[PDB]
Amino acid sequence: GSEDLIDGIIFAANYLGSTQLLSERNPSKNIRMMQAQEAVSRVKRMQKAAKIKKKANSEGDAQTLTEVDLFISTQRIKVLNADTQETMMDHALRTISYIADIGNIVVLMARRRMPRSAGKKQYKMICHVFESEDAQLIAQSIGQAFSVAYQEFLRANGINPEDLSQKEYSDIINTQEMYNDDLIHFSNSENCKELQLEKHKGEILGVVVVESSILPTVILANMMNGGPAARSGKLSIGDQIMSINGTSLVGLPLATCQGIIKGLKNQTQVKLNIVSCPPVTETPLYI
């Protein structure tokens, strides 16, 4: 249990679902425990409805949960579709804020970076729920992964345990997460305009350029009307896009960013965070 965690190990499990949640900035581990159990209740109660909707068989008969490969390494935690091997989630080992087994269930929690919105939980946690006969071992193995990552940090940098313990190691990692949360959370620089677009099915908005120049590497608006895009105004060619239905865009290529605008097809309710204030200090492609 060390040499192996570097290459990784795969545990089988059933992905029941994920849920976002509101949270205080930096709560206790006991509070994180509450959050996880509320997350698991919501997902289980949703799966229960899903099973019903499934029994009534519209057309196909796709299951409500999905068998997955739970990859674990000192570097990350990847959930892959057991059969298609398509990646469903890839979390840098350092982004996991809370992991735990609750019976035969494993919950993975992570901070959801996102510009705030105008008592109240102002921060957002994303919570992934899995089921496995080996929930206990998965949790233990992930824990073991943190330690080997630590030991490998000292080694790789020629540092000795007596100087940097694993606790300070954790603290360093949390601080960095916390910082990045705060960063994007208050990125409400000069115009965190929250939008709400309407759409139906298959249809799409349009296409725009990106690459903001060290700044909130987001995306700049660039044409495409008629469809939902400009159909509601409140948008401008040159308005930086921060988030899209939950996931931030600060620090992302185009395969993911422009890939999301491709996944909004069957939405009918798209959330967006734009800073706008443009536009100065072939042709075309929808999707």
Structure description:
With 287 residues, the chain is α+β, with helices and mostly antiparallel strands. It folds into two domains: 1-187, PH-domain like; 188-281, PDZ domain (Pdz3 Domain), CATH 2.30.42.10. It is built from six helices and eleven strands. It has helices at residues 3-7, 29-55, 135-157, 166-185, 228-231, 257-260, and strands at 9-23, 66-72, 76-81, 87-92, 96-101, 105-111, 123-131, 193-197, 240-244, 247-248, 270-276. It has a seven-stranded antiparallel β-sheet with strand order 4-3-2-1-7-6-5, with helices on both faces. The termini are far apart. It is classed as protein binding.
The geometry reads as globular
Adjacency order of strands in the biggest sheet: 4-3-2-1-7-6-5
What is the H level of CATH, i.e. the homologous superfamily of the largest domain?
Pleckstrin-homology domain (PH domain)/Phosphotyrosine-binding domain (PTB)
Global Rg: 21 Å
Q: Report the sheet with the most strands, covering strand number, pairing sense and barrel closure.
A: 7 strands, antiparallel
Q: H/E order of the elements?
A: HEHEEEEEEHHEHEEHE
Beta content comes to 25-35%
Q: Distance N terminus to C terminus? A: 46 Å
> Roughly what percent helix?
25-40%
Number of E strands: 11
CATH topology of the largest domain: PH-domain like
- The CATH first-level class of the largest domain comes to Mainly Beta
Count of separate DSSP helical elements: 6
Structural domain count = 2
For this entry, what is the oligomeric state of its chains? monomer
Broad structural category: alpha+beta
CATH architecture of the largest domain: Roll
